[PDB]
Amino acid sequence: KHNMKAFLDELKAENIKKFLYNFTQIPHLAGTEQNFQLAKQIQSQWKEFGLDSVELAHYDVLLSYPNKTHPNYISIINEDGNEIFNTSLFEPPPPGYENVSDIVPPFSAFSPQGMPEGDLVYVNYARTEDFFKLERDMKINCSGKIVIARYGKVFRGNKVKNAQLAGAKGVILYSDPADYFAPGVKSYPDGWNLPGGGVQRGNILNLNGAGDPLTPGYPANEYAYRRGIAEAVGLPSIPVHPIGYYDAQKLLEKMGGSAPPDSSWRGSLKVPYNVGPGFTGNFSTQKVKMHIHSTNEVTRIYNVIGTLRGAVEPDRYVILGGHRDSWVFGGIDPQSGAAVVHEIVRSFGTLKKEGWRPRRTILFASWDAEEFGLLGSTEWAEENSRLLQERGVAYINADSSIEGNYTLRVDCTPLMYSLVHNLTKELKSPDEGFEGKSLYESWTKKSPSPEFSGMPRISKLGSGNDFEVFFQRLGIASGRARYTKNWETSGYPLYHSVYETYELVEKFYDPMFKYHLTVAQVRGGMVFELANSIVLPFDCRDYAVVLRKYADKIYSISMKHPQEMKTYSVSFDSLFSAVKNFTEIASKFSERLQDFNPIVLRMMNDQLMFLERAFIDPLGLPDRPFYRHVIYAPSSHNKYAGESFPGIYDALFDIESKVDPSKAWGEVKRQIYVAAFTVQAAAETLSEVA
Amino acid sequence: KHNMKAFLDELKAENIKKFLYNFTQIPHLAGTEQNFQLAKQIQSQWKEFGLDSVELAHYDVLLSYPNKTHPNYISIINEDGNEIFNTSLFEPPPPGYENVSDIVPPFSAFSPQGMPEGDLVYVNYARTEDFFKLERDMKINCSGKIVIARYGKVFRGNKVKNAQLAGAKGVILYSDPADYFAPGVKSYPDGWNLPGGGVQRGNILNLNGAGDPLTPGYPANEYAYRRGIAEAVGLPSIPVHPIGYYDAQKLLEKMGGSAPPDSSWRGSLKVPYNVGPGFTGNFSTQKVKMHIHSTNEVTRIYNVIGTLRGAVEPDRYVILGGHRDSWVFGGIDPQSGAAVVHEIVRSFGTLKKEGWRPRRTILFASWDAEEFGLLGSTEWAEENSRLLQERGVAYINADSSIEGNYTLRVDCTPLMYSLVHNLTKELKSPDEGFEGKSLYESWTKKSPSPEFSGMPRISKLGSGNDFEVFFQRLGIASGRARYTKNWETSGYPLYHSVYETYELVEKFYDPMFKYHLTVAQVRGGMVFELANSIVLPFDCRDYAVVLRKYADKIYSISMKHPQEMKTYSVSFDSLFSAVKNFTEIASKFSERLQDFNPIVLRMMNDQLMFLERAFIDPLGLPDRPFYRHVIYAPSSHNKYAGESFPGIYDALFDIESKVDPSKAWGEVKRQIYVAAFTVQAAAETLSEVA
Ligand SMILES: *[C@@H]1O[C@H](CO)[C@@H](O[C@@H]2O[C@H](CO)[C@@H](O[C@@H]3O[C@H](CO)[C@@H](O)[C@H](O[C@H]4O[C@H](CO)[C@@H](O)[C@H](O)[C@@H]4O)[C@@H]3O)[C@H](O)[C@H]2NC(C)=O)[C@H](O)[C@H]1NC(C)=O
Ligand SMILES: *[C@@H]1O[C@H](CO)[C@@H](O[C@@H]2O[C@H](CO)[C@@H](O[C@@H]3O[C@H](CO)[C@@H](O)[C@H](O[C@H]4O[C@H](CO)[C@@H](O)[C@H](O)[C@@H]4O)[C@@H]3O)[C@H](O)[C@H]2NC(C)=O)[C@H](O)[C@H]1NC(C)=O
Ligand SMILES: *[C@@H]1O[C@H](CO)[C@@H](O[C@@H]2O[C@H](CO)[C@@H](O[C@@H]3O[C@H](CO)[C@@H](O)[C@H](O)[C@@H]3O)[C@H](O)[C@H]2NC(C)=O)[C@H](O)[C@H]1NC(C)=O
Ligand SMILES: *[C@@H]1O[C@H](CO)[C@@H](O[C@@H]2O[C@H](CO)[C@@H](O[C@@H]3O[C@H](CO)[C@@H](O)[C@H](O)[C@@H]3O)[C@H](O)[C@H]2NC(C)=O)[C@H](O)[C@H]1NC(C)=O
Ligand SMILES: *[C@@H]1O[C@H](CO)[C@@H](O[C@@H]2O[C@H](CO)[C@@H](O)[C@H](O)[C@H]2NC(C)=O)[C@H](O)[C@H]1NC(C)=O
Ligand SMILES: *[C@@H]1O[C@H](CO)[C@@H](O[C@@H]2O[C@H](CO)[C@@H](O)[C@H](O)[C@H]2NC(C)=O)[C@H](O)[C@H]1NC(C)=O
Ligand SMILES: *[C@@H]1O[C@H](CO)[C@@H](O[C@@H]2O[C@H](CO)[C@@H](O)[C@H](O)[C@H]2NC(C)=O)[C@H](O)[C@H]1NC(C)=O
Ligand SMILES: *[C@@H]1O[C@H](CO)[C@@H](O[C@@H]2O[C@H](CO)[C@@H](O)[C@H](O)[C@H]2NC(C)=O)[C@H](O)[C@H]1NC(C)=O
Ligand SMILES: *[C@@H]1O[C@H](CO)[C@@H](O[C@@H]2O[C@H](CO)[C@@H](O)[C@H](O)[C@H]2NC(C)=O)[C@H](O)[C@H]1NC(C)=O
Ligand SMILES: *[C@@H]1O[C@H](CO)[C@@H](O[C@@H]2O[C@H](CO)[C@@H](O)[C@H](O)[C@H]2NC(C)=O)[C@H](O)[C@H]1NC(C)=O
Ligand SMILES: *[C@@H]1O[C@H](CO)[C@@H](O)[C@H](O)[C@H]1NC(C)=O
Ligand SMILES: *[C@@H]1O[C@H](CO)[C@@H](O)[C@H](O)[C@H]1NC(C)=O
Ligand SMILES: *[C@@H]1O[C@H](CO)[C@@H](O)[C@H](O)[C@H]1NC(C)=O
Ligand SMILES: *[C@@H]1O[C@H](CO)[C@@H](O)[C@H](O)[C@H]1NC(C)=O
Ligand SMILES: [Ca+2]
Ligand SMILES: [Ca+2]
Ligand SMILES: [Cl-]
């Protein structure tokens, strides 16, 4: 039989290892020749593997690179203007790669140019609440200061936005060993920790879903009309640069001014973590000077798009996509994901050569420029939005397959909860001590859900990866899965560093490639069921359940302000009523789906498919037109985290500080109305159609 | 057989006459008890007629009414402040209706309150070009003046917007016999002309598709959050009032200042048509004073929604809709349309009782508050937007069935051109002298297309009726048809007057009700074919042909500025390329549709259905978010007229007067890009799906 078991059994750990090795010998930075070459290789191999068509889709997008002849760095400068300390020009390359060229030095992609000079202020993680604490409680003014913040907790774009709004004239990001050095583990190459010369690359945009900064709404094709730089979406207005903790120590050790307000502000270096501003008495005429010379440049990018045409519903698309561009070697990010996609394509192609086709069409994507703002996935989705709108069943992401070796992590729409539970009960656990047990059992045991005994945790989708356009813009059911760490005890230490290599993975994360194989089975299995099950494998009742949980949550937030709720007649009745209705209607739809003819089948599959779609508001969320999903948006404070009923949540956030409470509570009521309406309207898509 | 011929033959002129009589004995003003009663009657009758379900859908929307105890009127006032001339308080009621109550006196719905006093300026039709002529050429400043404009040429909302932007402090609208008195015809009741005491009612909003001014985007349901009045959509900021030509003469006869610039500014009254400002020497200390006391009030409205469930594709909706609210009796507008819908429902119900069902679902709508801004249709569509988006095959409007007795008028999407041609060849002409000939033949002979010999004229859809939300917001294929006048020789004279009665229609327009019957056959036939044909009856190649015509047209407009096109590198190449591609892809799709299994059939019907949909841009047109169709929008200068490639057209309009030509030509290029992309993207929806 050509069934899921055939598909699953053909996947091999040894192939994934070979592919990873193949993809990680040289850097594959977006817009560079080497990443174009790798695109061509993947296209040719996907064809050999048996896909029906494999094309490159290219776009010309805004990218950012350092200037090779004018390096970025930071100084401490004395009152004579002599540069007495300079940060590093590059990360010490790892063993045996000391002669690889084209390693991009650490930089913050899309930083403007500048050489600002000033006194430091230390802002902890540069979160919204860190700035609140500084300005409201400690009375420290960031205006015209250079801020230094530790990476961690939130997306670095949010940090930079927050620093900017606080008046900073530049930002220095660093990795504190408190967040990037696990106790008892050695620094690379002898372990998986970050060495003191290691540095995390990454873009600092605030795109809010826009894609290419120059072409929001429309693909960056050959005739596209581009905004001028000054009207581009999401660019920072102050210079930014990242450093390692050897260099951070030299910048922090002289800091004076106020003490840290408490221990949640102190990392692990041997410095006081004084907030500043400026240095202690002896050094108080010294200053910090940034030198940033990076340029933004419109550059061509290449997605690979493979199609395996469906036998019965070729106009229904199940998408497996993940990116191929890396900051340097991409040992984990993204090639541990891309290698898993490559083996999935290989396996599907094996069945296809023996005469099998999936029921529905499967699209396979190798995205470019993910690292620079999800640009490849977003431009292609803008291009194909109509097709995706009307035909898109589901999107399964496939970035990094591992960020730990402890258990499974799944983040997805509630519509896939039942699919994930069922599939994982059929897969073998790769974990030591659960030999002969199911992946469900090990996962549930290591990562129990907070709500329900005997079920595992599944998180809401956040952002900061290539499902964003599909889920939060277009409303296509989406999911992701990877192996992760124990989150009792920020992401893996070597993230976006030169040290993220093949050897890292092979020696320290997954020497047997069994975690990779488990993740290939989960991602591939999901795709298989989505593309082959007669009835789409979504359970609308799972949405009803979380909608009630989120409504309770948002209500409880508002209920912190009982007096204002009375004064302004702020009621959540409508939202609860809509949730109640969605619950009843969903339950009736499920009975019909169980008890119901290909037209009847197509009608009900269309109702399943369009259910995620129904949570889209074509007017978008306030000032974020590309975040259109009413239930889920990336947190306005942290693009990695998802927020539920984001419209209401943001209308409530910090509301006690607004100067016109009537206006602010008005807007809470407006968002309640929009949310209740959208829920009711989604529910009604599951009613009998006539 | 239950086929189209059975459906068509069951329609009777005599039933339509009876229904019209029934619907026109008392006024049915939106939001009044009598229009609610009539809603209930229609619901009960549609049930008796056999529909599967018939519901009322209500909304609470902003309406406008005069104050019964504080009448609106205009004066000429002398320097002592005595009111020496007053306009009428009401239209002299027609014979035998002199005791009907609840006739709303003439007023401009949604006028703010005020009593401005000032000098008159006469602004002809108050078109954009009339204001250009006054300000740029004649050097006449409207600021702080009361303007008087004749109705005609453009939607009265546009006139008021234009007066406002010119600085007017109030507007007086009147009906000039030049535009509302046909030569050799008697005034009502002895003919169909407008008497001098007759007055055209009508709203003066500029909603741009928003619906209820208080709830743009969302239905005005029981929990809706409403904007405050000051943030409402589309309300005028200066008082406005309409008058008849006896009263206009008294206001125009004393006018001095400049002569009319030419004869296109002179109507037919015995006055000079001086532009002003102000009155001639003797009367130069006299002034004009408005007294407007109307109130805007949130008021409940009621749509009737009837469903005839489809036997095979119940999740596909063919909609026949038209409004039921009238300004007074609604003899023509809308009851000549509503009576035709009522008989269509009756006929479909006859077949249904004998065991027939259409293939697809047919929805029947009696809309409320059309007269106040398309409010009923728009609120229901906002409510049901998701269902309509994914399931809406087509919308057939059904307002006034007649505005003349000369030939057929059809305005529709190009996707319905072939359907209309074919259907009309099968219908009998009702016209004198074409006995035994087809309606196609009489129509083509009386109204030849300007492009093609042997085909009839079919116009683009404009707006100012209830298809607006369906077509320009949601992208559902739409059409309308009615009997019309000879347009060699503005709309019918008695439009929106108390004199628009049953007797008007029966005595002067259609004594045999044969034109009504012909229009019922055309509208009903269209619905029948849309709802019953196995393959949707749309020809995508007809779109290809008009797209080329529109691209040529817009190019020719730009080519009036050859130097700027060179300087700014303004190319239409991309748009022509996209049109070319759409032509090729459409032609290949048609061959497959001819040469191709219910899934394959559903796939291709979905491609047909989603083709109109593909011209929607979810970002909307600039500053008009509810006009989302890229090919067609209502003219920014005249809501009744359609404009093609509206985004480009508006970017080019009056471009030689813009102060930053670089910026203005930039925006022309941006719109070219958006249009080319959208055309290409629509074309690609007709490519093989995988
Ligand atoms: C969840 O689904 C339920 C359906 O089971 C749905 O219930 C509906 O609630 C609306 C809103 O409350 C009801 O609206 C009423 O309709 C009647 C006519 O049928 C009107 O007369 C009512 O208006 C009067 O009373 C109001 C309330 O005090 C006054 O404000 C008003 O001025 C009038 O006096 C009122 O509009 C509706 O009938 C039911 N529908 C059904 C099918 O029962 C509920 O709304 C759904 N939740 C959401 C969020 O959609
Ligand atoms: C109508 O459909 C046709 C398909 O039959 C489609 O033609 C396409 O046109 C695009 C845009 O011109 C072509 O784009 C090129 O693609 C190649 C790779 O295949 C690139 O190398 C080209 O870029 C180079 O040259 C440019 C032009 O001078 C430079 O600006 C650039 O810097 C590079 O040097 C270029 O991007 C494309 O290949 C064809 N596609 C096909 C399938 O032939 C046309 O675009 C459609 N019209 C619209 C409006 O969509
Ligand atoms: C995940 O797996 C579960 C457990 O198998 C699936 O739920 C089961 O689905 C089956 C097939 O529809 C249900 O069977 C039906 O039983 C009813 C009456 O009990 C009968 O009317 C039908 O004809 C049919 O035999 C079964 O009840 C149901 N079990 C439970 C506990 O819900 C679930 O569907 C799977 N989810 C996905 C997304 O595949
Ligand atoms: C309006 O009526 C016209 C004229 O009847 C319809 O066009 C005709 O459609 C038929 C049915 O598809 C076409 O028949 C086909 O002929 C081809 C080869 O010539 C053959 O491959 C098919 O199997 C089939 O027999 C016919 O060619 C075509 N005639 C013309 C002149 O186009 C048209 O479809 C109608 N439009 C609508 C919207 O219904
Ligand atoms: C990654 O794998 C590919 C394919 O197995 C290698 O690329 C091939 O190289 C061979 C030998 O040089 C050529 O003859 C082929 O034309 C290439 N094939 C394709 C499809 O590109 C590639 O060299 C490997 N890269 C590394 C670093 O191991
Ligand atoms: C990268 O930095 C270099 C080196 O300092 C820049 O090149 C100089 O540009 C100036 C002014 O345009 C010239 O007069 C110098 O001769 C250039 N120096 C050299 C060494 O060629 C260069 O412009 C920067 N590159 C980018 C892309 O911005
Ligand atoms: C930090 O780097 C700067 C720039 O390379 C060094 O300062 C330069 O030193 C050279 C040689 O002494 C001078 O001719 C340049 O004029 C200096 N440039 C600037 C901008 O100051 C500095 O020595 C380095 N500092 C340390 C401690 O190594
Ligand atoms: C319009 O037609 C309807 C229906 O034929 C008339 O309303 C009916 O009136 C009869 C007699 O008074 C009642 O017993 C029915 O209950 C009514 N039916 C419905 C469905 O409402 C109505 O009177 C007619 N109106 C006029 C002005 O002729
Ligand atoms: C319609 O106009 C009337 C009549 O001039 C308004 O009624 C007056 O309102 C004032 C102030 O509110 C009272 O002191 C008067 O006694 C009222 N006059 C009468 C005759 O009752 C009335 O407010 C207006 N109606 C609306 C809806 O605006
Ligand atoms: C036009 O109407 C106004 C208002 O009804 C008339 O002026 C009023 O006349 C009465 C009785 O003479 C006075 O007590 C009111 O004070 C007047 N009101 C105002 C606002 O002026 C006027 O006579 C009418 N003019 C004509 C020519 O009929
Ligand atoms: C922060 O400092 C700047 C300039 O020195 C000033 O304009 C701004 O008001 C300051 N805000 C404070 C102290 O709250
Ligand atoms: C792999 O698992 C072991 C066993 O728990 C753990 O000690 C080690 O830290 C893990 N490796 C990585 C990179 O997490
Ligand atoms: C029109 O008149 C007003 C006020 O009397 C003035 O402010 C405005 O500039 C005028 N414009 C002209 C004469 O162009
Ligand atoms: C009806 O048609 C006749 C014949 O052409 C024409 O003279 C008359 O004006 C028409 N009636 C109306 C209301 O148009
Ligand atoms: Ca773009
Ligand atoms: Ca609304
Ligand atoms: Cl992922």
Ligand SMILES: [Cl-]
């Ligand atoms: Cl109409």
Ligand SMILES: [Zn+2]
């Ligand atoms: Zn990644």
Ligand SMILES: [Zn+2]
């Ligand atoms: Zn990354």
Ligand SMILES: [Zn+2]
């Ligand atoms: Zn009407």
Ligand SMILES: [Zn+2]
């Ligand atoms: Zn009307």
